[PDB]
A and B are shown apart, each in its own frame.
With several copies, the nearest count.
Chain A
Amino acid sequence: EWTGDSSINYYSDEVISDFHVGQFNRSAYFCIKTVKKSGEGTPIIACALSHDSKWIPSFNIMLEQARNFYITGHSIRVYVQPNVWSNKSFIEALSSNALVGLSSCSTSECFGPVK
């Protein structure tokens, strides 16, 4: 139940390009679309729901951090857990990845748990 498990995939040097907020069922949610600051590769979409999944306790710490990184535009590392959301419309629209971690990324090395 940690943002360091083998089941968590992280993408470094991401920059949060687009933000979205809404409500699914009875839970607020926010999705971040991050594009690599290279121009190669598909964007990474990570969503967090206020009252769903095992990542509820960190939702309020990921909403103000992504918004911190979206406004600043700093290069970041996104830790997501795939195949969390099940409502087909939700994955087909936004994503199935769950935003479970955010870290600050520097030029040489980038913070947070690795591997």
Chain B
Amino acid sequence: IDFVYRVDPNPPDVIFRDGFSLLGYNRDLQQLISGRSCAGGSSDSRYIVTTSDINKTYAIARAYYSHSKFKGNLYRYKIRADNNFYSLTPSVNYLESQGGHFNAYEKSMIRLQSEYVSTLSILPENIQKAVALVYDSSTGQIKDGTSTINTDYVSISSVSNPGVIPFLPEPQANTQQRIDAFGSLISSCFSIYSVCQTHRGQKTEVYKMPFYDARPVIQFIISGN
């Protein structure tokens, strides 16, 4: 894809200068997909997860807005993907070929998310515009509002890296670990605290999203009942 999208509550006037920063140094792909390295876990992932499907961002905004005690405003930033953006499917195939297992729970999870992972921090010149999502509480609608445009867009018009994430840690066997999800089967690494939400030392006081285990939910949708 050419453009990814990320929902962040910080206003564009602070994101266009600070951008998105890496949480920690957990480069494991197995932890990132299930969210053990993201805000639902150690909170030290080396990848910033952004979706290319516009409906997924609406899903994140809806999940955070229709929650009754999340006090904040959400902004959908569109980001120009470059050679540091990787689709999780090419790397899942490679990791599964080197002596690892990705169950159908983690295979049906990327299919629902259209995740693209950035190995390094999203530089402020990679974000083109920020649309202020407006939540009409009386109607209960999430609609696009003032769509500000960043002036630092380089406009190289590049594309994502269609290869595999380099230097992937060796997969761990017999993980038997949970997959953190929120909202309408929105994976972890998509929540607000799934990135470095500490600018100038202070932290934005918003809700800690409760994540549920996606494996029973994926089994529920697969089995139909």
**Chains A and B directly touch (beta carbon < 8 Å):** yes
Binding site for B on A (CB under 8 A): 13, 15, 17, 35-36, 38, 63-64, 67-68, 70-75, 106-109
Q: Please, how many angstroms separate the alpha-carbon atoms of A68 and B183 in the complex? A: 13
Chain B residues, Cβ within 8 Å of A64:
223-225
Q: How many angstroms from the CA of A71 to the CA of B185 in the assembled complex?
A: 6
Judge whether B184 and A70 touch: CB under 8 Å. yes
**Cross-chain contact B107 with A74 (CB below 8 angstroms):** yes
Task: Given A36-B141, A64-B224, decide whether A72 and B217 contact each other with a Cβ distance below 8 A.
Answer: yes
B137 & A67 in contact (Cβ 8 Å cutoff): no
Q: Is the CB of B219 within 8 A of A71?
A: yes
Q: What bracket does the count of chain B residues touching chain A fall in?
A: 35 or more
Give every chain A residue within 8 A of B62 (Cβ-Cβ). 17, 35, 106
Q: A36-B139, A107-B137 are in contact. Are A72 and B68 (CB under 8 A)?
A: no
A71 touches B67 (CB 8 A): no
Within 8 A of A (CB), among B176-225: 176, 178, 183-186, 210, 212-213, 215-225
A73 in contact with B107 (CB, 8 Å): yes
Knowing A36-B140, A36-B141, A38-B143, say if A72 contacts B103 (CB, 8 Å): yes
Is there a chain A Cβ closer than 8 Å to B144's Cβ?
yes
Closest chain-A Cβ to B38's Cβ sits at a distance in Å of: 18
Q: What would 21 A/B residue contacts be, using CB atoms closer than 8 Å?
A: A13-B68, A15-B55, A15-B59, A36-B140, A64-B224, A64-B225, A67-B220, A68-B223, A71-B105, A71-B218, A71-B222, A72-B107, A72-B184, A72-B185, A72-B212, A73-B59, A73-B184, A75-B55, A106-B66, A107-B140, A109-B140
